From Swiss-Prot, chain A:
The chain holds residues 1063 to 1454 of 1454 of the full protein. GO terms for cellular component: endosome membrane; fungal-type vacuole membrane; Golgi membrane; late endosome; mitochondrion; nucleus-vacuole junction; phagophore assembly site membrane; phosphatidylinositol 3-kinase complex, class III, type I. Serine/threonine-protein kinase required for cytoplasm to vacuole transport (Cvt) and autophagy as a part of the autophagy-specific VPS34 PI3-kinase complex I. This complex is essential to recruit the ATG8-phosphatidylinositol conjugate and the ATG12-ATG5 conjugate to the pre-autophagosomal structure. Is also involved in endosome-to-Golgi retrograde transport as part of the VPS34 PI3-kinase complex II. It comes from Saccharomyces cerevisiae (strain ATCC 204508 / S288c). Keywords: ATP-binding, Autophagy, Endosome, Golgi apparatus, Kinase, Lipoprotein, Membrane, Myristate, Nucleotide-binding, Phosphoprotein, Protein transport, Repeat, Serine/threonine-protein kinase, Transferase, Transport, WD repeat. Autophosphorylated. WD repeats lie at residues 16-56, 64-103, 167-206, 213-253, 282-320, 351-383. This is Serine/threonine-protein kinase VPS15. The WD region forms a seven-bladed propeller resembling that of typical G-beta subunits and is required to bind GPA1 and ATG14. Truncation of 30 residues from the C-terminus results in a temperature-conditional defect in protein sorting.
From Swiss-Prot, chain B:
This is Vacuolar protein sorting-associated protein 38. Present with 1070 molecules/cell in log phase SD medium. It is found in: Golgi apparatus, trans-Golgi network membrane; Endosome membrane. Belongs to the VPS38 family. The lineage of its organism: Eukaryota, Fungi, Dikarya, Ascomycota, Saccharomycotina. Involved in endosome-to-Golgi retrograde transport as part of the VPS34 PI3-kinase complex II. This complex is required for the endosome-to-Golgi retrieval of PEP1 and KEX2, and the recruitment of VPS5 and VPS7, two components of the retromer complex, to endosomal membranes (probably through generating a specific pool of phosphatidylinositol 3-phosphate allowing the recruitment of the retromer complex proteins to the endosome). Mediates the interaction between VPS30 and the VPS34-VPS15 core complex, leading to the recruitment of VPS30 to the membrane. Disruption phenotype: Abnormal reticulophagy. Component of the VPS34 PI3-kinase complex II composed of VPS15, VPS30, VPS34 and VPS38.
From Swiss-Prot, chain C:
The keyword Membrane applies. Present with 2490 molecules/cell in log phase SD medium. Residues 15-198 are annotated as: BARA. GO terms for biological process: autophagosome assembly; autophagy; cellular response to nitrogen starvation; cellular response to potassium ion starvation; cytoplasm to vacuole targeting by the Cvt pathway; late endosome to vacuole transport; macroautophagy; mitophagy. Its main location: membrane. The C-terminal domain called the BARA domain is dispensable for the construction of both VPS34 PI3-kinase complexes, but is specifically required for autophagy through the targeting of complex I to the pre-autophagosomal structure. This is Vacuolar protein sorting-associated protein 30. One of its GO terms (cellular component) is vacuole-isolation membrane contact site. The keyword Kinase does not apply.
Amino acid sequence: NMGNLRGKLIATLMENEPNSITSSAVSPGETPYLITGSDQGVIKIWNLKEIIVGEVYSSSLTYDCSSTVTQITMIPNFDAFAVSSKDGQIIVLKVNHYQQESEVKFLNCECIRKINLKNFGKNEYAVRMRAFVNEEKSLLVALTNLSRVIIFDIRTLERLQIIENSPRHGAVSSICIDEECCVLILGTTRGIIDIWDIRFNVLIRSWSFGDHAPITHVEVCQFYGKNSVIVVGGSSKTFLTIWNFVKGHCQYAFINSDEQPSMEHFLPIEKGLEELNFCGIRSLNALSTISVSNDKILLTDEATSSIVMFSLNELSSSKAVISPSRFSDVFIPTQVTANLTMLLRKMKSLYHHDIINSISTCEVDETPLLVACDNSGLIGIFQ
Amino acid sequence: LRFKKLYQLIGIFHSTDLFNSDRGYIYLLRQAGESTKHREYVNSQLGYYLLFLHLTAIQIFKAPLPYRLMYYGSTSVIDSQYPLYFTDQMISKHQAKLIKAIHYFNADILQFKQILENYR
Amino acid sequence: QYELSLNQLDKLRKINIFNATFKISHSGPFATINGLRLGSIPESVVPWKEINAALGQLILLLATINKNLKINLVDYELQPMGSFSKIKKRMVNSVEYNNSTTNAPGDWLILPVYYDEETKFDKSLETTLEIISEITRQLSTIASSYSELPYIMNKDKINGLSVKLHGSSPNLEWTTAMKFLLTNVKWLLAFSSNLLSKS
């Protein structure tokens, strides 16, 4: 668990001032390979240890996409880095590195496979991309410009199947994969939650709750298992809503407020239909980023502009990595319902940075640490 | 552009603040060990007076830096756990000053990168 | 981004003070310069090298003033380095010796204002006060060119306080003396800001 550490920021580096990175990912190992994209369609790669010791701050590797990039992800148990670009360009670059003088260095970046998303015929841009490799077989999944689920086989670089969310749900609010990866978890711009079974090729269930607003993100938590999913969205005051799929209820809801919410309002919405008119929020506290691993769920708070960390083990001991100068916040949970618990956060400046468009958790093989890329095109690291 | 011109005036302020440091600049360990004797131990700490100008650049830019820095002049506090200027204090103090040298070097490179990130 | 802009506006309001770097404020019983505590009381004494560094910062301020105003120093020569402050005061000797021509180049007896590395620091202090008087003189000339005497000091005693170390340990005398002297130095610094603004 890395949540116990102080987490002071030891580095600040920005290669490209001009635009924000559309994606940020890291290649795990003994010597982590840092990677971040660009809104100008540039691929940047930095060396972990090199930035840790010598503190050299520049791009260790640079690849020209020549067109704006959409997203990126590192292939599980592999050195390959997959990336999708809003030009409708899907490609994966294989890593090439060497080890000398009791250290490591990078050689060259070249795309292994090239598949045009413009070959769909409607000229759709890739929205979000998530790839996975099972010992059985390996593949990738992506969302179209019309928010359509398409799973391309990583082996043959061809489309295995094409899934389409109902237009009554608006657009796709997120992307997530099941533990067995036989099911896809996707949110809705209409403020609905939809889990679908790719096995029988249908939509398993459609859920909604809270203020019925747009869902920020959706993912499958580790400690919560495949039987429970974590979804940021829905009710305004609620920061993160975690609900068990089978149980049909929200077990733990983390909310920022000075009071406990309504039980009737927090109850699961089912009978509701597509007739609901979309109501969102234009406030600056809406858009945010979150990354969760190893029993620790980290969430960037755009409200107070600070990095927060919620430990799934104890929400009590949970706290914010970086905060304001004057004082910090005190948080603690409770339970109104036998099947549902809720965490409360009670509130009580040299660092200057814009909103965080991307964040990634990492280990230096010595001490754990976090990296972040903001909307101003600046990156930073805290150990 | 305003704060840039003010940083130019502050640059002239550093030029007028240049007495002990003229021919040299911030960019060396063996150089320190070699020049330690020839500098009479005056120009050593006087060369460590650059931490004041660095701290001046810090507070002016208001940008967070990789290494914790406090400029006491002659013997300056780095991270509060390490001295900026050894001035041939001891054998282990040379090691502490070595780690501190790596520190200040890293902060110098990072700050140089931050300056290289400058754009309109 | 707009928040960063406003922060830059406040940073500009602070940037109006950019002339102040080595500037001294008052903290506790004494006054510290640019975050360097000067003077020592009967309760908590400060370090010798700390006082040396502070004096080096003061000499750096004097050198910065001499560089800024571009004024010529008649009897003085400025060589601040780190904590050690070299101040060369050219003056005549006893001149009772007939064997000494003294028609050629020479130097000061003791340059250094730094100690612990009768008291030369006392002579350097009196010479510093006289240098402040001459500073107010040339500044009065600059004022007459552009067209204010709060400091009362005597070479032996400044504002009633003892400016002489006499080789003894730190006391209330040198503490209050350093106080008044640093305050007057701050006033003269403000005057230097006014002159730099008027020129």
